[PDB]
Amino acid sequence: MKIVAIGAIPFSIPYTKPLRFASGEVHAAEHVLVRVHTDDGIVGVAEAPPRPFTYGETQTGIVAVIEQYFAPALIGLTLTEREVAHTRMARTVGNPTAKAAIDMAMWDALGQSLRLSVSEMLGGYTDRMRVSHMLGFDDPVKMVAEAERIRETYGINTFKVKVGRRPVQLDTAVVRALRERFGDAIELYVDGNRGWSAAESLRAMREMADLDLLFAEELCPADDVLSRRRLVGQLDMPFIADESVPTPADVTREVLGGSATAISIKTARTGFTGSTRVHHLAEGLGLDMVMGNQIDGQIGTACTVSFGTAFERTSRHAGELSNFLDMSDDLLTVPLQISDGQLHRRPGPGLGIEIDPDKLAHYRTD
Amino acid sequence: MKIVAIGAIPFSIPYTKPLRFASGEVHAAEHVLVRVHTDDGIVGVAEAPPRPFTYGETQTGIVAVIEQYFAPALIGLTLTEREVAHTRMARTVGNPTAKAAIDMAMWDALGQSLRLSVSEMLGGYTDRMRVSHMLGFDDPVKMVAEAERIRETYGINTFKVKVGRRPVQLDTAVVRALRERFGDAIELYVDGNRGWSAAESLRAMREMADLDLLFAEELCPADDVLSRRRLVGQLDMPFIADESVPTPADVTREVLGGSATAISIKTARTGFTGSTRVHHLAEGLGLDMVMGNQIDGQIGTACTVSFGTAFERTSRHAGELSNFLDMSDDLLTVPLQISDGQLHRRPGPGLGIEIDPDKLAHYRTD
Numbered sequence A, B: 001m002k003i004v005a006i007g008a009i010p011f012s013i014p015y016t017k018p019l020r021f022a023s024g025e026v027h028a029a030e031h032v033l034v035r036v037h038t039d040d041g042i043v044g045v046a047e048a049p050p051r052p053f054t055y056g057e058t059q060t061g062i063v064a065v066i067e068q069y070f071a072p073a074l075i076g077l078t079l080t081e082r083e084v085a086h087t088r089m090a091r092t093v094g095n096p097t098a099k100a101a102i103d104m105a106m107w108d109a110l111g112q113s114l115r116l117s118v119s120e121m122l123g124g125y126t127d128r129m130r131v132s133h134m135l136g137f138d139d140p141v142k143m144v145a146e147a148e149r150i151r152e153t154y155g156i157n158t159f160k161v162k163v164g165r166r167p168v169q170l171d172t173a174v175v176r177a178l179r180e181r182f183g184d185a186i187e188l189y190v191d192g193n194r195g196w197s198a199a200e201s202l203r204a205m206r207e208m209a210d211l212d213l214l215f216a217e218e219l220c221p222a223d224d225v226l227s228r229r230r231l232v233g234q235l236d237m238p239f240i241a242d243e244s245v246p247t248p249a250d251v252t253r254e255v256l257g258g259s260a261t262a263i264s265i266k267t268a269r270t271g272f273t274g275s276t277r278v279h280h281l282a283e284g285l286g287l288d289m290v291m292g293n294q295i296d297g298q299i300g301t302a303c304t305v306s307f308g309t310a311f312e313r314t315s316r317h318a319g320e321l322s323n324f325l326d327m328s329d330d331l332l333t334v335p336l337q338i339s340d341g342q343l344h345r346r347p348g349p350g351l352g353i354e355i356d357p358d359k360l361a362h363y364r365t366d
């Protein structure tokens, strides 16, 4: 189980319809397929989604850091030296998805080598997660229609509404429309992606005080430090930190500082080894945690469910596992299937997925 | 890899010489051998040391809780459902070593099943740890002689001196004698086992301010809450919490409250699954951590080194891995070997140990 090579292949798949939010937009999945090759002939895989508006990474930069720094530093390590890999990669600051992809690809290879799923190796608490769908910006009536279509089609009963627009009433009207349309049959929460000021955020939440929102996520910039802390202290529900807590150290600083009261865990940025560190820190401190979506393709979604199903604290909440549906196509030989509002972790070893050679050849851009 | 049975066998092995400290004494290793049997014929093992003066557990109580509560709740789970086992056992409060033994025995069985050492499955950062020896109470000249004998014989260069006696000068004279005898060639720190008041502790440490002590461990009772917090804030070096932080929740309360500035990790009380939670919490918060000794036999010591070698934060410090040497005998087919002041993690699968049938038959007390 020795790593003999690590590759990073850029690919691009168009979205049937773009996902729009406060901090940016995604019109195509211009990701990087990361592969870890072992001396047993096993190939572990994962993807790295460049999100310049979130971590500052670019598709070109991800391939570069992996080919120029991480690959040469990790070749030669066995799949059971994760902490050595973790420590070596840590010598380089940032580059979250690049690091995470390598770690998850390593876990995929390990699982295949041992004939064990990543989920069970991580803890195997359960075998499925409830699904939450992120609704991107669009005309009010159009967002409601999207939710209705999605719930009827896939059985999804949890929706995270993207907000952060002006006037604030535009978004609060959307949320109210959703609650009037579905009643208490669905769970609802919001993510502003740093779009509103803390003052606008409070007014928006006060206006939606009767809509039973489960969480408020990054309503205003965490970097508007003092007003952010004041806002978090004014809200009843937990305030989920996402882009502001990419590392365990950030979780500690933001939570102890009062700028976060709940933690988003995204395998795209902390992989499995790092995500375990975040989960244990959040559980130890006593904070709610939710599996988030990095606008993942099916490869990243398979990773999210693999980790989310391994622990009780992550599976007690619905996981954001459905945005891959807006992609026009994907790289798996067998597409992920959501039914009854749930997604099961794959039964196969490792991530339980396989890359379709023809799909890769068609969408790669190198 | 399904658990078909879990047994708890009490055994007793006399000590060549008793280990004495502030909170109690150990004249024999009256432990409990815990075994997890799988449907593959594999048997994982570990030990549970009853420490009434530390956790309140008794040899009889450990066997009882395992046979009456844990065994029936875990039979039927696979070795890759650790989080289910963790959650089920958590329904019962306390009983730390009983829970830890079951978890470590499960990891031992898993490793054997996969032909992987526990150390590598946990992270595989390194393959050995430096050794630290705990010096129990005794006449000053006798404690110094013990340190000299131990250093020359095993190459051990780190010593944790047991203190907490009155007058305080009795212990400070011991530490000073050790520093004068070995100079800067050895590392020294102290553990008072809640023996001194906070006021006595400060005076003792001030008297030893020139002896370069690396840590101060449980000098006074953590339950003397306010004076304990005042003391911790008065000391330069990290203050290791041990018996006061048996769980991650305690780590959070004591650290945020200011009654602890460093954390002791003992596999005897948090096993591997639980110890990982403590390590990640301590790393996330930014606190030093040291692998402690629960006055472990060789079985427990094999567990300590297995976990300690898996991470960088635990292996950067010497681990307390030598007190088993005072036992008159032990249960392993192949005794642990300390040389050049180090202990390597065993090369074999799981814990890399095997119980000698004749030793078990001779020392069991059921």
Ligand SMILES: O=C(O)C[C@H]1C=CC(=O)O1
Pocket (backbone or CB within 6 Å): A021, A023, A051, A054, A134, A191, A193, A242, A292, A293, A294, A295
């Ligand atoms: O923020 C989210 O939860 C969803 C998405 C928006 C940007 C991004 O990278 O993640």
Ligand SMILES: O=C(O)C[C@H]1C=CC(=O)O1
Pocket (backbone or CB within 6 Å): B021, B023, B051, B054, B134, B191, B193, B242, B292, B293, B294, B295
């Ligand atoms: O306190 C220590 O570090 C050593 C030992 C003393 C009692 C016990 O259970 O552990």
Ligand SMILES: [Mg+2]
Pocket (backbone or CB within 6 Å): A191, A217, A218, A242, A243, A264, A292
């Ligand atoms: Mg978000």
Ligand SMILES: [Mg+2]
Pocket (backbone or CB within 6 Å): B191, B217, B218, B242, B243, B264, B292
């Ligand atoms: Mg101690």
